[model samples]
Target: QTSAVQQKLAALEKSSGGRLGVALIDTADNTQVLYRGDERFPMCSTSKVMAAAAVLKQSETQKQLLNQPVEIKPADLVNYNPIAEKHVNGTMTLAELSAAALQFSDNTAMNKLIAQLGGPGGVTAFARAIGDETFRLDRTEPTLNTAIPGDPRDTTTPRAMAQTLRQLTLGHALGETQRAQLVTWLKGNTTGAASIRAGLPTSWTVGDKAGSGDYGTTNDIAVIWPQGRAPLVLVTYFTQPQQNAESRRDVLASAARIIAEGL
Candidate 1:
C-alpha cells in the first residue's frame, strides 16, 4: 500500500529539525499510522485529561462527588490559571474543576483536580487499571511542566496515549454516563486550536488536549468523528534541542491533514 502520509511526516520531521512522533488509529477498521510513535514525550498539561479521568473513575463510587464543593486556597494558585483565579479562596464543584482543567487548561484548577485524585499515584493507578502500562504521572503541576529532555518523570508513548485515550473515551473504562461527561469536556477544550483541531474537516467533531514545555516539547492528542465514517484517534508529539530551536504547532496540524487525506 502507498503511504504518502509517512513520507510527508518524515519531511515534516526534517523541516522541524527536531524529533517528531505521531499515531493515528481508526476505530472502525483499526487502520494505523505510526511514526516514532513508541518514543516517549512529555505529557505537560495534557495530563489534566488523565487526572480528570482518575477523578471520574473515583466518582463512580461516590455519586455526589461531582456535585460536592471543594475548597481551594489562594496560595496554591499557579500561573496560567485564568479561570481558577476567580475561584480563589472560594469553592467549586468537582465537575467545575475538571472542566476548567480540561477545557480552559487552568493550571491551578488542574492541581486542585489532582488533589482530588489523592495525588498523582491515583492517576497511575487509573492508567494501570485501564491496561495502560506506559503512562506515568509522578509530579504535580508547575514542577511537572519542567519537561526536561530524557526525563521519564511524566511521559508516555504516542501510541500508548492514543490507545489509552480510545479506551477512556470509547471503551468501557468509565461508566457510560461518566464517559459521556468526560468526552463532553474533551470536546469542549478551548486551549488547543493550532494543532489537531486546525486540520480536521469542518463537519468532523474534534476533541483534543494540547501541551507545551521545555526542550521544545509540543503535543496534541485528539478524538475525531468524521462525518459518515468511523471515529479516529490522533496523537502528535515533538521535541527538539534546548537551544536555538522551537516546537512547531503546525507540525501536528499538517500531520492531521496528511492522515485525514491519506485515509
Candidate 2:
C-alpha cells in the first residue's frame, strides 16, 4: 500500500479502535511496507493458505486425485467444528477438501488434507522448497504449545506471505497447473467477506483465505487478481483484544472499502 494512502488508512484505524495492522504489495514492482502494527501477529486461519499450498504441491507430485475418497474416522472427527460437521460421516475428494479448507476455512478438511500431504513434515518441506522457512505445521507435537500439525502459528511476515501468494498465483513456486489449482481453491474461500470482498467491483475477481480466533485476532491474505490491471496482494491482521466481533467486522469492512477506493 502507498504511504500517502497509508496515512489516510491509519487515521481510520485510530477512529476505529486501532485494531488494524496490514501490508500489501505489488511483487512485480517489489513495493512494500511493514507498518507500526505490521509485524507478524499470531495469525489464525490465514495460515491455511500456506497449508493449502503445501497440500496442492503434494497433490500435483503424487498425481493424487483431488476427488479420491477418504473416510472420516470417529477419532478424526471433531465435534462443534463446522467443517467436521459438514463433512463428517461422509467422504470427499482431495480437491474438495483443499477447496473447503480455503473457502470455508474448514478445520477438519485442513487437518485431513495436511495429513494426506504427509503432515507437518510435508508442509515444512514444501515451505522450505519455496524459501518460506518460517512457515511450519507442527502436527506431530504433543498437545499444543505451538507447531501442532493443525494449529496456527505466531508466524508469517506480511511481505513474505504476500509474496508467497503472489508466486502461487503466477506459478513461480508451483507450475501453472498447480498455480491454477490454487486460484480455483482460493476463489471459494468464504471467510473474509468484509475485508477482501466488500469493495471490489462485481466484474472483478478476487481470491482469498481468512482466519479469525477467540483471542480477537483476525487475518485475511489473498491475491486480488483484478483483470486488466496489475494484480495486488493484500494482508490484513488484526490483534486488538478489546473489540467485539461486530465492531471488528465493521471496522475491517470499512478499512477494505477505504483501500478499495484508495486503489
Give me the candidate number with maximum lDDT: 1
Q: Report clash pairs, candidate 2.
A: 66-94, 66-95, 103-188, 103-189, 103-190, 138-147, 138-149, 139-149
**lDDT (Cα, tens digit) per residue for candidate 1, span 1-263:** 22778898899889888888899989988877899989988888788889998889888999889998888787879878888889888998989999999999988888888888778887888899899999999998888877777799889998999999998898899999899999999999987888888887888999889988777778899999999988999999888877335767887888888888887
The parts of candidate 1 lying over 4 Å away from their true place are: 243-247
Model 2: weakest 10-residue lDDT segment is 141-150
Model 1: ten consecutive residues of lowest lDDT: 239-248
Candidate 2, overall lDDT? Answer: 0.65
Clashes of 2: 8
Top candidate on TM-score is 1
| Clash list (residue pairs), candidate 1 | none
Q: For residues 172-258, write the lDDT of model 2, one tens digit per residue.
A: 888677888888888876666776677566566788887665445566777776767777777776655443433255555555566
